[PDB]
Amino acid sequence: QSVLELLPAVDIVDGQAVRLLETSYGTPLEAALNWQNDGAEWVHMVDLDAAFGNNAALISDVVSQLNVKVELSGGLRDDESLERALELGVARVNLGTAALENPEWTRKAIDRFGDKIAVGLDVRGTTLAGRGWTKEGGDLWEVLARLEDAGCARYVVTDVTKDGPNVELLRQMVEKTGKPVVASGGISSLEDLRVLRELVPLGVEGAIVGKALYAGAFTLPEALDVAGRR
Amino acid sequence: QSVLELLPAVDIVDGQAVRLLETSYGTPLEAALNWQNDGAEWVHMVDLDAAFGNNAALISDVVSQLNVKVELSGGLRDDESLERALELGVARVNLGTAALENPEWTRKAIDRFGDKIAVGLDVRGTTLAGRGWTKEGGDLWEVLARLEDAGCARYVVTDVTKDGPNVELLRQMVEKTGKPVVASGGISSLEDLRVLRELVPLGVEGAIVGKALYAGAFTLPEALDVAGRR
Amino acid sequence: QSVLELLPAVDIVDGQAVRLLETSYGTPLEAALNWQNDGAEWVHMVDLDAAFGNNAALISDVVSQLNVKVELSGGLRDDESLERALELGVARVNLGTAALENPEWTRKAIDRFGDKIAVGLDVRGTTLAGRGWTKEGGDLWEVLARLEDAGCARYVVTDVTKDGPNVELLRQMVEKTGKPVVASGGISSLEDLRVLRELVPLGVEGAIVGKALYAGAFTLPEALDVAGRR
Amino acid sequence: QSVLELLPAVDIVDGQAVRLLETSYGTPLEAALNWQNDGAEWVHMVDLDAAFGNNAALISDVVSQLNVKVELSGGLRDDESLERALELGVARVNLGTAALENPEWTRKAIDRFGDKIAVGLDVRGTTLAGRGWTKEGGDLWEVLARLEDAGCARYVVTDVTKDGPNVELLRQMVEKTGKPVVASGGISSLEDLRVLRELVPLGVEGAIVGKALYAGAFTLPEALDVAGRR
Amino acid sequence: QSVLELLPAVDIVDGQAVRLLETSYGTPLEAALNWQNDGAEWVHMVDLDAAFGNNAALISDVVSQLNVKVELSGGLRDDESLERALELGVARVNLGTAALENPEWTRKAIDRFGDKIAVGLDVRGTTLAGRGWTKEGGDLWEVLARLEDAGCARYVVTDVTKDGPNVELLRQMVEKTGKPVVASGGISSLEDLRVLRELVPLGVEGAIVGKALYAGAFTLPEALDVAGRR
Amino acid sequence: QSVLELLPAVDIVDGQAVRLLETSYGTPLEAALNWQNDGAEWVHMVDLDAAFGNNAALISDVVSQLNVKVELSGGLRDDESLERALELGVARVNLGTAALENPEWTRKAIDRFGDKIAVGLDVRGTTLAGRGWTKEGGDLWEVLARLEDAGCARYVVTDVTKDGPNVELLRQMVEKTGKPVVASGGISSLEDLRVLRELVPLGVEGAIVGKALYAGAFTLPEALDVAGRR
Ligand SMILES: [Cl-]
Ligand SMILES: [Cl-]
Ligand SMILES: [Cl-]
Ligand SMILES: [Cl-]
Ligand SMILES: [Cl-]
Ligand SMILES: [Cl-]
Ligand SMILES: [Cl-]
Ligand SMILES: [Cl-]
Ligand SMILES: [Cl-]
Ligand SMILES: [Cl-]
Ligand SMILES: [Cl-]
Ligand SMILES: [Cl-]
């Protein structure tokens, strides 16, 4: 059975990161090291300071001192922020809002950096998240169409609903694009990982895991045993 | 028996939050996680720094890493503050003073954001709280009348007296508006939760809990057993 | 026997407060919570940062999360400082030096805010404390006369001598004014609390307690048993 | 036998103070409280931040919450610094260098504030300490002559040599002035306290103690038993 | 058998450094001391703050208080940064990107400072790492050719791939240059150290070790036993 | 046998100092106190913040509260820095680079302050350390000649090589100058202290100790037993 990659979360907030052992804080390195110690191949690192930051050295420490691969997201919205992030040596970045608000910029980024770029999409069902005073979340399939035309290598789809994984949506995206899709959200137990691993032959590549870890539904080693060991 | 939702409090003060285990401080995530671990569906998060702040990343961490829903209040007084708060992805916000001092702004907010907006009212009996040099707390029923005309989805009524829950007031508001009302204050024991849960069929939706928790009157699991488990 | 109210001290210094368990520091909330846990009805909170500060959020946390009533003092010397303090929702404030240096301002404050205002007087015997290069402590009875004409609701008299409670002075003030008087200083043992409680029928309302607590002369529960439980 | 007062040292450095239990740091209040707990009547508090500072709130906390009397020194060199220090309510201050470099200012201070002012003199044998590029330590007896003419109430003489107490010098000063003299330095054992206590009838009032405490030569209770209990 | 030198890593990030005992943070001195305590001759110190800083005093502390030799890298990109680093007294520095982007500057540095200068090259296989919007990693052998013409004393080759040591590349560089080469990356077990030590007679001088230490593959004493004890 | 004075090191770095008990950080006072507790007469205090700072209060605390004598070095390079350091009351200072780069200034300092001034010389064998872009370490004997003409009271010679004590150099300097010389570096065991103590009759006065302490070669009490107890 083909392996479902896991990307346990590391959130950088006020220049530190929670680590799940109970909880403690410390550096992003210590949080990512905890996951590596458990058998992780990847971490999904979100720089929340940058998103809403000067954590470049903290991020570079993770890249330089750990074997785990870093997928970095948060505030990668313009030429300077993107170039600086890639200069840190991370394995991959995720673009988010601006990549959908600035489609030509996203295309320019994909053209230049190729498989180092993935695009994140936050969804409630099949609706894109986000509502401001004058802006609304666009049409998911119209957005996907633009990214596909740009040759986006990889999609990260985060279900943000609070009210299991959306298999139908993940299926539709893998079929429209023929690209790897990474799922996030909708995971409450190891059974949800089983459900996602059944989709690996269809193109679901991996899952970001975080909420279920902090909720104590399972540990990372338990998740890796279910998702698959390479 | 219909369930009374509980919204245990998390107060962000100097960029940290007390957690009740004895007390310790740490991040808002750790405080909200403690409640989630106890079975909470919601937390009522007050950004006191913003009210009297740059806690956006701390708040986003809670939203992103926890299953608990966040009702966010504190300093949501103008277009920028409101839009920024909603951009954090929180389930709901509460407006307070400005929403009563700027009725047209409140109406504009309700029109645009709908059920993401609730309005908080601080009361002593049936008098609105607040006295300045030249401003006084307005007429509770005149204020409610304006909010009802605006189509406010939900009210959060906090009894600030220090001298049980005001059943008569909560009854009157649910009947005037036909909207859900969340109670805060006047809770000293589990019996007060019983009293409030009897009002769920009349439209009392939930209770914010905080004072009684810190006073040791009960624990959150004990409260949830009384208020109801879904 | 009529109860003598106790107002155990909480001093906010560099944005933190000592807590007496040995001593430890933490937030003003944790200090006030310790007293509440012991049975306190009130705390006497002094913002020393403001007096000699941006502790508004820390103070609001105490008001919002605790059942104990807060009597707040420190740097309440002008329209802005006073209005901001009252906006925090505290039960009562104490004015100090400026209230005696600006009698018309004090009168204006008393007229507007009524029983939310008490005035603190520091004394050595019957002499008002304070000596600068060009200013001296005024005449205690001349100052009291002005406050009485203004209708001051309540006096807090702090004996600052270091060289038991001054029963004669407290008696004279209760008789001149017919107002409640709160005593501070001159307490070295539980017997001093007995002495003060005998004055409750004459108008001594309460005692601030602090020095004797830190000196280990008694604990707060021991003091409350002597002063009276409501 | 007349009692020799002890004034154990508290040094405020970077807004904190070492406490001798081993050593730990914390607030000036906690350091002064440790001495009070041991039976101290006085502490000799040096604000080193001010000397070489905004510790006003920390100092006021000590004054307000402790029974121990504070003798405050450090950076009290001009009208503003002196007035601010006295406004903190401390029992006594010590003037140092400026009081000898600005004799008329010192006289003005003594005239206004009387027994709240003592003057500190640092000595090596009978030579005043201090050598700059263009300034030298003046003549001890010529300096004393000016202070005596000014009516200085009290002298604090600190022996700064590192190469027992100088009984002859302390004798000469008490006889020239008829004023109380407080000794500091030259104390290596309890016997040195005995030597100093024999001088109490001649006018040596007290000793600052610090070096011997940190050196472990004795504890404060042991010192108080030797110096005398009132 | 000729000894392979080990250069265990110390990364200075936010003015502190992780130490591997589990992990803890503290000063760069404490991290380097841990390695020295284990038998290290060298540490490879990276100032990540400078790279992406004012850690000069922290670095000087290591140089001054420890017997271990420091190889310092990070942000040594111009005349001022280089001169300041060498003024700290470190045994050796490593130049990185600028040394390849500014070949004449690198030559000037090598000419002046000789064997105090080594040049670091980050590689994926035989491709130089780094891709920006308009800049790409140059040709490894063309870069090496320029450094050889400049008389570069020593090369530090870091394999940054995440997808054993590259013996062929290390062989080619030692043969092209006749200079010592230090390897970094590609070490997952003690066997990889054996592989590298076999290359010591060919000119591989040492290995930086870090990833494998934090991964728990071996301890530093275990590594030193394999690499060789002098 | 004449005693060899020991001057255990205290390095002030980021306003704190490592203390060797394992290691911990705290204040310079706590570090110097540890040495005093072990029997030290002197500490050699280096203000690395000043060298590469506002540690004046921290330094004054050491001087004022401890019996140990302080030899202070670091950044004493000009009239203001030197005068300020001496105003802290330290027993002695060491001048370093500027004293050799500004010989007339050094002479002016020696003329004014006499035996309070010692000059530090960093050496590799008999070569003065330091190489910049345009400056080189001068000729050791030519530098010494200038200092001797100036009447320098004392020399501190630090061997900075990393590749026992240099008896020949220390001998030559004591004979050229007839002044006390303090050695630093080249100490790996108690035997090296024996070697240095044999030179006391020739004019070697003392040794700074630090590297060997942190390396665990001996403890300070063990060193004092070897160097001599007065
Ligand atoms: Cl990576
Ligand atoms: Cl998850
Ligand atoms: Cl939420
Ligand atoms: Cl409650
Ligand atoms: Cl209150
Ligand atoms: Cl008291
Ligand atoms: Cl006092
Ligand atoms: Cl002493
Ligand atoms: Cl080095
Ligand atoms: Cl490694
Ligand atoms: Cl000294
Ligand atoms: Cl040494």
Side-chain angles (χ1 to χ4, degrees):
Chain A
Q1 189 178 204
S2 295
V3 170
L4 178 75
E5 297 180 351
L6 300 185
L7 310 87
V10 175
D11 275 3
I12 313 176
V13 176
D14 279 2
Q16 62 172 9
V18 80
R19 174 158 91 262
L20 187 72
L21 299 167
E22 299 152 5
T23 56
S24 53
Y25 278 87
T27 62
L29 177 281
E30 288 176 305
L33 178 56
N34 179 53
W35 301 144
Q36 183 182 276
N37 285 340
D38 284 343
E41 180 175 3
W42 279 95
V43 294
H44 181 79
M45 189 159 291
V46 184
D47 186 347
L48 288 182
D49 297 326
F52 301 101
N54 200 352
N55 294 318
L58 289 175
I59 296 162
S60 176
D61 196 25
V62 181
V63 171
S64 304
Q65 297 324 297
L66 301 187
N67 297 311
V68 80
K69 287 178 285 199
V70 176
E71 176 172 69
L72 179 68
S73 79
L76 310 181
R77 64 172 75 87
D78 55 32
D79 290 343
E80 195 176 317
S81 55
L82 177 60
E83 188 172 55
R84 289 178 166 201
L86 290 168
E87 287 182 347
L88 308 175
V90 298
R92 190 155 84 198
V93 299
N94 285 183
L95 311 182
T97 310
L100 330 176
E101 289 176 346
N102 297 277
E104 293 89 346
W105 177 78
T106 300
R107 180 187 297 266
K108 187 185 75 178
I110 291 161
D111 288 346
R112 180 66 189 165
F113 298 114
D115 61 36
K116 290 263 195 71
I117 309 295
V119 172
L121 306 157
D122 285 354
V123 297
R124 298 191 198 263
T126 54
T127 305
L128 283 164
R131 187 184 178 75
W133 287 110
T134 68
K135 308 280 181 194
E136 287 145 20
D139 181 282
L140 170 60
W141 303 115
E142 290 174 333
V143 169
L144 189 67
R146 300 191 315 247
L147 294 166
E148 299 164 78
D149 190 71
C152 181
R154 182 175 277 99
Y155 300 89
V156 182
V157 180
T158 298
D159 176 0
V160 301
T161 56
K162 294 186 181 180
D163 69 25
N166 189 343
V167 169
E168 295 85 355
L169 173 56
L170 295 169
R171 183 208 82 252
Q172 296 183 59
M173 294 178 59
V174 294
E175 295 180 316
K176 260 175 183 190
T177 64
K179 298 296 185 190
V181 174
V182 174
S184 184
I187 297 169
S188 68
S189 74
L190 289 169
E191 183 67 24
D192 293 316
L193 297 180
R194 295 187 185 97
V195 163
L196 289 165
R197 185 176 184 179
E198 294 168 11
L199 304 178
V200 172
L202 313 172
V204 173
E205 188 185 50
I208 293 160
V209 290
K211 284 174 173 179
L213 297 167
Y214 285 77
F218 49 78
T219 68
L220 183 65
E222 290 168 347
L224 287 161
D225 291 337
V226 174
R229 304 269 186 180
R230 282 178 166 147
Chain B
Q1 189 178 204
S2 295
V3 170
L4 178 75
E5 297 180 351
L6 300 185
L7 310 87
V10 175
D11 275 3
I12 313 176
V13 176
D14 279 2
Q16 62 172 9
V18 80
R19 174 158 91 262
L20 187 72
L21 299 167
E22 299 152 5
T23 56
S24 53
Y25 278 87
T27 62
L29 177 281
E30 288 176 305
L33 178 56
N34 179 53
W35 301 144
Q36 183 182 276
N37 285 340
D38 284 343
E41 180 175 3
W42 279 95
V43 294
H44 181 79
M45 189 159 291
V46 184
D47 186 347
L48 288 182
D49 297 326
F52 301 101
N54 200 352
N55 294 318
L58 289 175
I59 296 162
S60 176
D61 196 25
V62 181
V63 171
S64 304
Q65 297 324 297
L66 301 187
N67 297 311
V68 80
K69 287 178 285 199
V70 176
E71 176 172 69
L72 179 68
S73 79
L76 310 181
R77 64 172 75 87
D78 55 32
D79 290 343
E80 195 176 317
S81 55
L82 177 60
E83 188 172 55
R84 289 178 166 201
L86 290 168
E87 287 182 347
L88 308 175
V90 298
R92 190 155 84 198
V93 299
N94 285 183
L95 311 182
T97 310
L100 330 176
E101 289 176 346
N102 297 277
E104 293 89 346
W105 177 78
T106 300
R107 180 187 297 266
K108 187 185 75 178
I110 291 161
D111 288 346
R112 180 66 189 165
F113 298 114
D115 61 36
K116 290 263 195 71
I117 309 295
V119 172
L121 306 157
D122 285 354
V123 297
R124 298 191 198 263
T126 54
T127 305
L128 283 164
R131 187 184 178 75
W133 287 110
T134 68
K135 308 280 181 194
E136 287 145 20
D139 181 282
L140 170 60
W141 303 115
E142 290 174 333
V143 169
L144 189 67
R146 300 191 315 247
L147 294 166
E148 299 164 78
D149 190 71
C152 181
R154 182 175 277 99
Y155 300 89
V156 182
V157 180
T158 298
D159 176 0
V160 301
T161 56
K162 294 186 181 180
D163 69 25
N166 189 343
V167 169
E168 295 85 355
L169 173 56
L170 295 169
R171 183 208 82 252
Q172 296 183 59
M173 294 178 59
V174 294
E175 295 180 316
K176 260 175 183 190
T177 64
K179 298 296 185 190
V181 174
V182 174
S184 184
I187 297 169
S188 68
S189 74
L190 289 169
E191 183 67 24
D192 293 316
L193 297 180
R194 295 187 185 97
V195 163
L196 289 165
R197 185 176 184 179
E198 294 168 11
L199 304 178
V200 172
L202 313 172
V204 173
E205 188 185 50
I208 293 160
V209 290
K211 284 174 173 179
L213 297 167
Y214 285 77
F218 49 78
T219 68
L220 183 65
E222 290 168 347
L224 287 161
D225 291 337
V226 174
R229 304 269 186 180
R230 282 178 166 147
Chain C
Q1 189 178 204
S2 295
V3 170
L4 178 75
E5 297 180 351
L6 300 185
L7 310 87
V10 175
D11 275 3
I12 313 176
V13 176
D14 279 2
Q16 62 172 9
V18 80
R19 174 158 91 262
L20 187 72
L21 299 167
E22 299 152 5
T23 56
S24 53
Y25 278 87
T27 62
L29 177 281
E30 288 176 305
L33 178 56
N34 179 53
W35 301 144
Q36 183 182 276
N37 285 340
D38 284 343
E41 180 175 3
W42 279 95
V43 294
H44 181 79
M45 189 159 291
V46 184
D47 186 347
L48 288 182
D49 297 326
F52 301 101
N54 200 352
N55 294 318
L58 289 175
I59 296 162
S60 176
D61 196 25
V62 181
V63 171
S64 304
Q65 297 324 297
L66 301 187
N67 297 311
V68 80
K69 287 178 285 199
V70 176
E71 176 172 69
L72 179 68
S73 79
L76 310 181
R77 64 172 75 87
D78 55 32
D79 290 343
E80 195 176 317
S81 55
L82 177 60
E83 188 172 55
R84 289 178 166 201
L86 290 168
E87 287 182 347
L88 308 175
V90 298
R92 190 155 84 198
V93 299
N94 285 183
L95 311 182
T97 310
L100 330 176
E101 289 176 346
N102 297 277
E104 293 89 346
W105 177 78
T106 300
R107 180 187 297 266
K108 187 185 75 178
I110 291 161
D111 288 346
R112 180 66 189 165
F113 298 114
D115 61 36
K116 290 263 195 71
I117 309 295
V119 172
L121 306 157
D122 285 354
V123 297
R124 298 191 198 263
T126 54
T127 305
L128 283 164
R131 187 184 178 75
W133 287 110
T134 68
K135 308 280 181 194
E136 287 145 20
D139 181 282
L140 170 60
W141 303 115
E142 290 174 333
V143 169
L144 189 67
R146 300 191 315 247
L147 294 166
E148 299 164 78
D149 190 71
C152 181
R154 182 175 277 99
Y155 300 89
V156 182
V157 180
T158 298
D159 176 0
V160 301
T161 56
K162 294 186 181 180
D163 69 25
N166 189 343
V167 169
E168 295 85 355
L169 173 56
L170 295 169
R171 183 208 82 252
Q172 296 183 59
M173 294 178 59
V174 294
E175 295 180 316
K176 260 175 183 190
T177 64
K179 298 296 185 190
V181 174
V182 174
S184 184
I187 297 169
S188 68
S189 74
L190 289 169
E191 183 67 24
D192 293 316
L193 297 180
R194 295 187 185 97
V195 163
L196 289 165
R197 185 176 184 179
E198 294 168 11
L199 304 178
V200 172
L202 313 172
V204 173
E205 188 185 50
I208 293 160
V209 290
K211 284 174 173 179
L213 297 167
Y214 285 77
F218 49 78
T219 68
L220 183 65
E222 290 168 347
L224 287 161
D225 291 337
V226 174
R229 304 269 186 180
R230 282 178 166 147
Chain D
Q1 189 178 204
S2 295
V3 170
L4 178 75
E5 297 180 351
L6 300 185
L7 310 87
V10 175
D11 275 3
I12 313 176
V13 176
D14 279 2
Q16 62 172 9
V18 80
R19 174 158 91 262
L20 187 72
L21 299 167
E22 299 152 5
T23 56
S24 53
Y25 278 87
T27 62
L29 177 281
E30 288 176 305
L33 178 56
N34 179 53
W35 301 144
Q36 183 182 276
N37 285 340
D38 284 343
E41 180 175 3
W42 279 95
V43 294
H44 181 79
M45 189 159 291
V46 184
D47 186 347
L48 288 182
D49 297 326
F52 301 101
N54 200 352
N55 294 318
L58 289 175
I59 296 162
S60 176
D61 196 25
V62 181
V63 171
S64 304
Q65 297 324 297
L66 301 187
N67 297 311
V68 80
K69 287 178 285 199
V70 176
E71 176 172 69
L72 179 68
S73 79
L76 310 181
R77 64 172 75 87
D78 55 32
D79 290 343
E80 195 176 317
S81 55
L82 177 60
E83 188 172 55
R84 289 178 166 201
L86 290 168
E87 287 182 347
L88 308 175
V90 298
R92 190 155 84 198
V93 299
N94 285 183
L95 311 182
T97 310
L100 330 176
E101 289 176 346
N102 297 277
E104 293 89 346
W105 177 78
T106 300
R107 180 187 297 266
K108 187 185 75 178
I110 291 161
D111 288 346
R112 180 66 189 165
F113 298 114
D115 61 36
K116 290 263 195 71
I117 309 295
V119 172
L121 306 157
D122 285 354
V123 297
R124 298 191 198 263
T126 54
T127 305
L128 283 164
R131 187 184 178 75
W133 287 110
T134 68
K135 308 280 181 194
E136 287 145 20
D139 181 282
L140 170 60
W141 303 115
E142 290 174 333
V143 169
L144 189 67
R146 300 191 315 247
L147 294 166
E148 299 164 78
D149 190 71
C152 181
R154 182 175 277 99
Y155 300 89
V156 182
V157 180
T158 298
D159 176 0
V160 301
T161 56
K162 294 186 181 180
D163 69 25
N166 189 343
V167 169
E168 295 85 355
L169 173 56
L170 295 169
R171 183 208 82 252
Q172 296 183 59
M173 294 178 59
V174 294
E175 295 180 316
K176 260 175 183 190
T177 64
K179 298 296 185 190
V181 174
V182 174
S184 184
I187 297 169
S188 68
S189 74
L190 289 169
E191 183 67 24
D192 293 316
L193 297 180
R194 295 187 185 97
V195 163
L196 289 165
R197 185 176 184 179
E198 294 168 11
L199 304 178
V200 172
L202 313 172
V204 173
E205 188 185 50
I208 293 160
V209 290
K211 284 174 173 179
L213 297 167
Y214 285 77
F218 49 78
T219 68
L220 183 65
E222 290 168 347
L224 287 161
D225 291 337
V226 174
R229 304 269 186 180
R230 282 178 166 147
Chain E
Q1 189 178 204
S2 295
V3 170
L4 178 75
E5 297 180 351
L6 300 185
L7 310 87
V10 175
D11 275 3
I12 313 176
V13 176
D14 279 2
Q16 62 172 9
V18 80
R19 174 158 91 262
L20 187 72
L21 299 167
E22 299 152 5
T23 56
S24 53
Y25 278 87
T27 62
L29 177 281
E30 288 176 305
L33 178 56
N34 179 53
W35 301 144
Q36 183 182 276
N37 285 340
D38 284 343
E41 180 175 3
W42 279 95
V43 294
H44 181 79
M45 189 159 291
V46 184
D47 186 347
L48 288 182
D49 297 326
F52 301 101
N54 200 352
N55 294 318
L58 289 175
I59 296 162
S60 176
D61 196 25
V62 181
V63 171
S64 304
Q65 297 324 297
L66 301 187
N67 297 311
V68 80
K69 287 178 285 199
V70 176
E71 176 172 69
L72 179 68
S73 79
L76 310 181
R77 64 172 75 87
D78 55 32
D79 290 343
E80 195 176 317
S81 55
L82 177 60
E83 188 172 55
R84 289 178 166 201
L86 290 168
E87 287 182 347
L88 308 175
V90 298
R92 190 155 84 198
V93 299
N94 285 183
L95 311 182
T97 310
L100 330 176
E101 289 176 346
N102 297 277
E104 293 89 346
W105 177 78
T106 300
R107 180 187 297 266
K108 187 185 75 178
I110 291 161
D111 288 346
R112 180 66 189 165
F113 298 114
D115 61 36
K116 290 263 195 71
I117 309 295
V119 172
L121 306 157
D122 285 354
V123 297
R124 298 191 198 263
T126 54
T127 305
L128 283 164
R131 187 184 178 75
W133 287 110
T134 68
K135 308 280 181 194
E136 287 145 20
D139 181 282
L140 170 60
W141 303 115
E142 290 174 333
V143 169
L144 189 67
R146 300 191 315 247
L147 294 166
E148 299 164 78
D149 190 71
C152 181
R154 182 175 277 99
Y155 300 89
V156 182
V157 180
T158 298
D159 176 0
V160 301
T161 56
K162 294 186 181 180
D163 69 25
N166 189 343
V167 169
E168 295 85 355
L169 173 56
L170 295 169
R171 183 208 82 252
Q172 296 183 59
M173 294 178 59
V174 294
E175 295 180 316
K176 260 175 183 190
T177 64
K179 298 296 185 190
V181 174
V182 174
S184 184
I187 297 169
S188 68
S189 74
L190 289 169
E191 183 67 24
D192 293 316
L193 297 180
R194 295 187 185 97
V195 163
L196 289 165
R197 185 176 184 179
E198 294 168 11
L199 304 178
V200 172
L202 313 172
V204 173
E205 188 185 50
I208 293 160
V209 290
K211 284 174 173 179
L213 297 167
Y214 285 77
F218 49 78
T219 68
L220 183 65
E222 290 168 347
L224 287 161
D225 291 337
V226 174
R229 304 269 186 180
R230 282 178 166 147
Chain F
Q1 189 178 204
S2 295
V3 170
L4 178 75
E5 297 180 351
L6 300 185
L7 310 87
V10 175
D11 275 3
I12 313 176
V13 176
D14 279 2
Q16 62 172 9
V18 80
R19 174 158 91 262
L20 187 72
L21 299 167
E22 299 152 5
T23 56
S24 53
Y25 278 87
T27 62
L29 177 281
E30 288 176 305
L33 178 56
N34 179 53
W35 301 144
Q36 183 182 276
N37 285 340
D38 284 343
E41 180 175 3
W42 279 95
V43 294
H44 181 79
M45 189 159 291
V46 184
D47 186 347
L48 288 182
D49 297 326
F52 301 101
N54 200 352
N55 294 318
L58 289 175
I59 296 162
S60 176
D61 196 25
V62 181
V63 171
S64 304
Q65 297 324 297
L66 301 187
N67 297 311
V68 80
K69 287 178 285 199
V70 176
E71 176 172 69
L72 179 68
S73 79
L76 310 181
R77 64 172 75 87
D78 55 32
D79 290 343
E80 195 176 317
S81 55
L82 177 60
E83 188 172 55
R84 289 178 166 201
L86 290 168
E87 287 182 347
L88 308 175
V90 298
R92 190 155 84 198
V93 299
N94 285 183
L95 311 182
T97 310
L100 330 176
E101 289 176 346
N102 297 277
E104 293 89 346
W105 177 78
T106 300
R107 180 187 297 266
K108 187 185 75 178
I110 291 161
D111 288 346
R112 180 66 189 165
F113 298 114
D115 61 36
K116 290 263 195 71
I117 309 295
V119 172
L121 306 157
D122 285 354
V123 297
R124 298 191 198 263
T126 54
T127 305
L128 283 164
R131 187 184 178 75
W133 287 110
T134 68
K135 308 280 181 194
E136 287 145 20
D139 181 282
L140 170 60
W141 303 115
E142 290 174 333
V143 169
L144 189 67
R146 300 191 315 247
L147 294 166
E148 299 164 78
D149 190 71
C152 181
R154 182 175 277 99
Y155 300 89
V156 182
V157 180
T158 298
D159 176 0
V160 301
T161 56
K162 294 186 181 180
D163 69 25
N166 189 343
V167 169
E168 295 85 355
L169 173 56
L170 295 169
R171 183 208 82 252
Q172 296 183 59
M173 294 178 59
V174 294
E175 295 180 316
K176 260 175 183 190
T177 64
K179 298 296 185 190
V181 174
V182 174
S184 184
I187 297 169
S188 68
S189 74
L190 289 169
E191 183 67 24
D192 293 316
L193 297 180
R194 295 187 185 97
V195 163
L196 289 165
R197 185 176 184 179
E198 294 168 11
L199 304 178
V200 172
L202 313 172
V204 173
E205 188 185 50
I208 293 160
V209 290
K211 284 174 173 179
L213 297 167
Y214 285 77
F218 49 78
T219 68
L220 183 65
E222 290 168 347
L224 287 161
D225 291 337
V226 174
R229 304 269 186 180
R230 282 178 166 147

